[PDB]
Design a protein around this ligand. Structure first.
Ligand SMILES: CCC(=O)Nc1nnc(S(N)(=O)=O)s1
Ligand SMILES: [Zn+2]
Length: 257
């Protein structure tokens, strides 16, 4: 089964998921000087006030906080999007050291981690149908740098000891994802894909320019998670990022000058 190791990592994924070599794969390097400012792009609308988190789960490749997406409770709209996208889950990608971990890069710079808030287009009714559509999902990507702590992240990091190994989950209610957002909603956007199998080419990517800062203690907690299930040889869940993929025939647009 796929993973991030030498024998099952991103360089191997194309054998089970041939779309890995497709025309709109993610992540990509964001070349800030080539991205074109698009004045037609609208401000992002992030409506998270009624978000209902449900569970936190170690799925063997990341940890994920899942939300009630049976109603228009926490929705993404505007920006480059047509229509309404419901928040399903957020998760992170991070490194073994602070100089790597993000999936997208900015002028080849890697951040310590990257937060993905995953939303799906309500016109397709459920996320399984949305992943089969070129505009089915919108993922909001936020870079993490190491410095000052992010207070809104602490409730997440403090329960990670309870989901150390693959398959473990816990109740995780009343978590407010607004505490993970930076000040600015300036963004880059391009058409791309899921960055884990099945690598489906269904994602409008919205990557925020402004990182959030997290503390070393916070990201050290990420690095204590396990890829393995309980009872298997301990393999730290670190470096769970796919590297930048060829941009091919795509334009990255910027919402800001
Ligand atoms: C449909 C469930 C789901 O969200 N799958 C994802 N697969 N890759 C994602 S990423 N790393 O691009 O945000 S999300
Ligand atoms: Zn992700």
């Amino acid at each position: 089964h796929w993973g991030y190791g030498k024998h099952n990592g991103p360089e191997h994924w194309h054998k089970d998921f041939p779309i890995a070599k497709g025309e709109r794969q993610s992540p990509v390097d964001i070349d800030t000087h080539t991205a074109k400012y698009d004045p037609s792009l609208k401000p992002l609308s992030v409506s998270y006030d009624q978000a209902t988190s449900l569970r936190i789960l170690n799925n063997g490749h990341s940890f994920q906080v899942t939300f009630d997406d049976s109603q228009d409770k926490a929705v993404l709209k505007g920006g480059p999007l047509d229509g309404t996208y419901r928040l399903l889950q957020f998760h992170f990608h991070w490194g073994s050291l602070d100089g790597q971990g993000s999936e997208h890069t900015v002028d080849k710079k890697k951040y310590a981690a990257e937060l993905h808030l995953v939303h799906w287009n309500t016109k397709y009714g459920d996320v399984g149908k949305a992943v089969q559509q070129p505009d089915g999902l919108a993922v909001l990507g936020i870079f993490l740098k190491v410095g000052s702590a992010k207070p809104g992240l602490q409730k997440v990091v403090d329960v990670l000891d309870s989901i150390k190994t693959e398959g473990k989950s816990a109740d995780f209610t009343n978590f407010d994802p607004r505490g993970l957002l930076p000040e600015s909603l300036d963004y880059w956007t391009y058409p791309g894909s899921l960055t884990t199998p099945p690598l489906a080419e269904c994602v409008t990517w919205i990557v925020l320019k402004e990182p959030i800062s997290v503390s070393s203690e916070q990201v050290l907690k990420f690095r204590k998670l396990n890829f393995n299930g309980e009872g298997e040889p301990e393999e730290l869940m670190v470096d769970n990022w796919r590297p930048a993929q060829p941009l091919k025939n795509r334009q990255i647009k910027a919402s800001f000058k």
